[PDB]
Structure 1
Amino acid sequence: MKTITLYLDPASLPALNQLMDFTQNNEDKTHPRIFGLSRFKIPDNIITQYQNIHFVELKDNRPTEALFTILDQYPGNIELNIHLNIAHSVQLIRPILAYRFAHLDRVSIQQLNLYDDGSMEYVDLEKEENKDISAEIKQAEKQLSHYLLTGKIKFDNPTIARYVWQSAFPVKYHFLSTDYFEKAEFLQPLKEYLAENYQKMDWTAYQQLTPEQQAFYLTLVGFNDEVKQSLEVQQAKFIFTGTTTAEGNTDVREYYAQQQLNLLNHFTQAEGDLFIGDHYKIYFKGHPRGGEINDYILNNAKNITNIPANISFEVLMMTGLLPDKVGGVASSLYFSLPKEKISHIIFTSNKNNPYVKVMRRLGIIDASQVIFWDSLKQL
């Protein structure tokens, strides 16, 4: 029959990983592909090279009904190769299962490849610390069965349910942190349950690509020559990393912008609590979804080189263009950054802190008192 590959992610990290998958399998120009990556626009010059390449919008963390129109274009027997965001897996696959129900004779799920949204999955797991994990797993598999058979969603534990897909399909999990699963003792039952169905995100994949594929990849993630050259300068560098929010909208978005600018000053100003030194060239790597928050930094800071917000930080690691130091608000990017390059990681207020616990458990931060940006004086 025929295999159809779907790349779905409303966030950044899973999409970054999925674009690598696309690059590795980019030779086949006719393999049907459906892209549902909210934060990525595949360049037109690349699209034209492929046939049976489709695009679908995501709304409320699930592909829209426009997905059914695409699938109807393949009348034969089709096996779905689905790539998903782990945190949002249940909703992202919802429309796919609904379609399958109506075309049970020709539509089947071939396999699932799941990738971490980022720190979110770990913060969520951290909250399950006092649960009987072994029992939570059994209940989740049961409720997953109910979802697969009735199409209805009802999970007593939405978090653990994200990890019981193997009970229904061939699966492969790609974790931002395999250490968390080994260091969090309360999760031992889960680690054992997952058996050989997981691996850590492979950040060395880019280096294994051919010279042609690496350029294909760089084009997909937006890493142009101008940015590359700005990072090839000879001088110690410091990249300030931004964050974003979705809380209280406007008011909170403006609070975030102001606290982030103040944070930057604490790193770059001689009188700052986190002053890095004067020999560093300053760069700003804003959050992909920072929006007005990123603009606030550029409009109110000086002598700072902007690295387009849409360019995922990990790309610098892949290209071997990491700076000497990195500092900013807690982010998923710090999970794969070499410890020697960490300046300071600051946490946001606006409510024990689950995120703090996760990074401490992984040794990303030490036992010392954590810095929340609401405790930094206005410079």
Structure 2
Amino acid sequence: MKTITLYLDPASLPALNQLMDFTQNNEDKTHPRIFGLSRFKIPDNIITQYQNIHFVELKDNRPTEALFTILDQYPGNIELNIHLNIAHSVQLIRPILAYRFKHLDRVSIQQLNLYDDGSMEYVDLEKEENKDISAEIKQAEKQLSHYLLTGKIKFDNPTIARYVWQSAFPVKYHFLSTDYFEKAEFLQPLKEYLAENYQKMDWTAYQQLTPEQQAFYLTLVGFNDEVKQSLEVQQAKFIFTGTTTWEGNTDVREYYAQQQLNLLNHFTQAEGDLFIGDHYKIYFKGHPRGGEINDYILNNAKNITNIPANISFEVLMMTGLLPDKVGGVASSLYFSLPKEKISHIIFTSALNNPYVKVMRRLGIIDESQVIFWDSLKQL
């Protein structure tokens, strides 16, 4: 009997947590590990310290069939310790279930550890506000059973389906907001169902690591001394945070880039609606997938210091390097930001906007008139 740990995430936030789990378990050099983290490359000089370390691409939110070749190397009874993105859990586990079916006598699922993609889970949950949540859970459990028995995916409620894994496996959920499950009264049956199977994402985990593990972790997430030194400047700091679009449409991507540059100007120019003051040093923390939208800010802004877009914002909180003020388009990063540091959060374009509702529920935004980015004069 042998445990194999899989770390799967096409996004950022679950991978960030999973790399913490790997760091905590980094003394064990031989434990079989499969990394399917789209946004993170484990440095070679770390890879070389480990045996039984494997890598798999994700395509369409699941491990490719390359997974099967890796698993074939382990010919005995194997138990899978699987780490997943919640929003994408059903697809990510699909090839794992298919492999289990082919080797039903030797392959088992030990447990699941699941982490929020980010704001998406909460925006999705907000849309379920008028449903009988208790009934949705019971139906999702039944349809999960069919998935597990047949390999066929069919959920009447794809959103609630993300939360019923306990009906089949030992599970632990790691939520960006545990407050949401307390504050959204319509979700009470889900809170109660999830019982003792969840905790909040622990942003104090880094602080409890040894100095050696802290250095190891920072190497995994792409943090380095130069970014550290850039943020240790003796001046008040403002970080402008970027967003992205998943649309490939040039019109849409150019629109996003232009509108986001205009937003930055509203923060940093004296005439801007959101003017922060002349004494701040300005940084840009682009979205990890901003791509040319990121480039547009760096090319068209002035006196801005880039924080490499691949560095997740929450690392600055872990390292105690948060700036005085943070502003930009609504992002998952605002879910764990101390409220005193929020300048303004801007929504893309509506009181009943589900993202607005989520943040209002959570006390991240107040009762004032929300700001959409197309409400801003082109400066």
Q: TM-score, normalised by structure 2?
A: 0.99
C-alpha deviation, 1:133, in angstroms: 0.2
CA distance in 2, matches of 1:139, 1:47: 43
C-alpha deviation, 1:375, in angstroms: 0.9
CA distance in 2, matches of 1:123, 1:262: 26
Q: Work out the percentage of aligned pairs sharing the same amino acid.
A: 99
C-alpha deviation, 1:247, in angstroms: 2.5
- Aligned-partner SS, 2:287: coil
CA distance in 1, matches of 2:351, 2:156: 24
The residue that corresponds to 2:215 in the other structure is 215
CA distance in 1, matches of 2:39, 2:248: 22
CA distance in 2, matches of 1:157, 1:181: 18
CA distance in 1, matches of 2:253, 2:332: 20
CA distance in 2, matches of 1:170, 1:4: 16
The residue that corresponds to 1:121 in the other structure is 121
Q: TM-score, normalised by structure 1?
A: 0.99
Give the unaligned 5+ runs of structure 1: none
Structure 1 range deviating more: 273-282 or 239-248: 239-248
Shift of the 44–226 alpha-carbon distance from structure 1 to 2, 3 Å rule, reads same
The C-alpha deviation readout for 1:74-125, integer Å capped at 9, x for no partner, is 0011000000000000000000000000000110000000000000000000
C-alpha deviation, 1:51, in angstroms: 0.3
Give the unaligned 5+ runs of structure 2: none
The residue that corresponds to 1:170 in the other structure is 170
> Which segments of structure 1 move beyond 2 Å, counting only runs of 4 or more?
none
- Aligned-partner SS, 1:298: helix
C-alpha deviation, 1:246, in angstroms: 1.1
CA distance in 1, matches of 2:246, 2:323: 29
The answer (yes or no) to whether the contact 2:351–2:357 under 8 Å persists in 1 is no
Structure 1 range deviating more: 239-248 or 225-234: 239-248
The residue that corresponds to 1:362 in the other structure is 362
The C-alpha deviation readout for 1:146-189, integer Å capped at 9, x for no partner, is 00000000000000000000000000000000000000000000
What RMSD in Å do the two structures reach over aligned CA positions?
1.0
The residue that corresponds to 2:233 in the other structure is 233
- Aligned-partner SS, 2:371: coil
C-alpha deviation, 1:249, in angstroms: 2.3
C-alpha deviation, 1:251, in angstroms: 1.2
CA distance in 2, matches of 1:100, 1:166: 18
C-alpha deviation, 1:350, in angstroms: 12
Structure 1 range deviating more: 317-326 or 244-253: 244-253
C-alpha deviation, 1:248, in angstroms: 5.2
Structure 1 range deviating more: 178-187 or 246-255: 246-255
- Aligned-partner SS, 1:82: strand
CA distance in 2, matches of 1:369, 1:52: 54
- Aligned-partner SS, 1:282: strand
Shift of the 365–205 alpha-carbon distance from structure 1 to 2, 3 Å rule, reads same
The C-alpha deviation readout for 1:296-317, integer Å capped at 9, x for no partner, is 0000001000000000000000
The C-alpha deviation readout for 1:22-43, integer Å capped at 9, x for no partner, is 0000000000000000000000
- Aligned-partner SS, 1:63: coil
The answer (yes or no) to whether the contact 2:284–2:307 under 8 Å persists in 1 is yes
- Aligned-partner SS, 1:377: coil
CA distance in 2, matches of 1:302, 1:89: 42
The C-alpha deviation readout for 1:223-267, integer Å capped at 9, x for no partner, is 010000000111110000000001352210110000000000000
Shift of the 351–310 alpha-carbon distance from structure 1 to 2, 3 Å rule, reads farther
The answer (yes or no) to whether the contact 2:177–2:200 under 8 Å persists in 1 is yes
- Aligned-partner SS, 2:101: helix
CA distance in 2, matches of 1:219, 1:351: 42
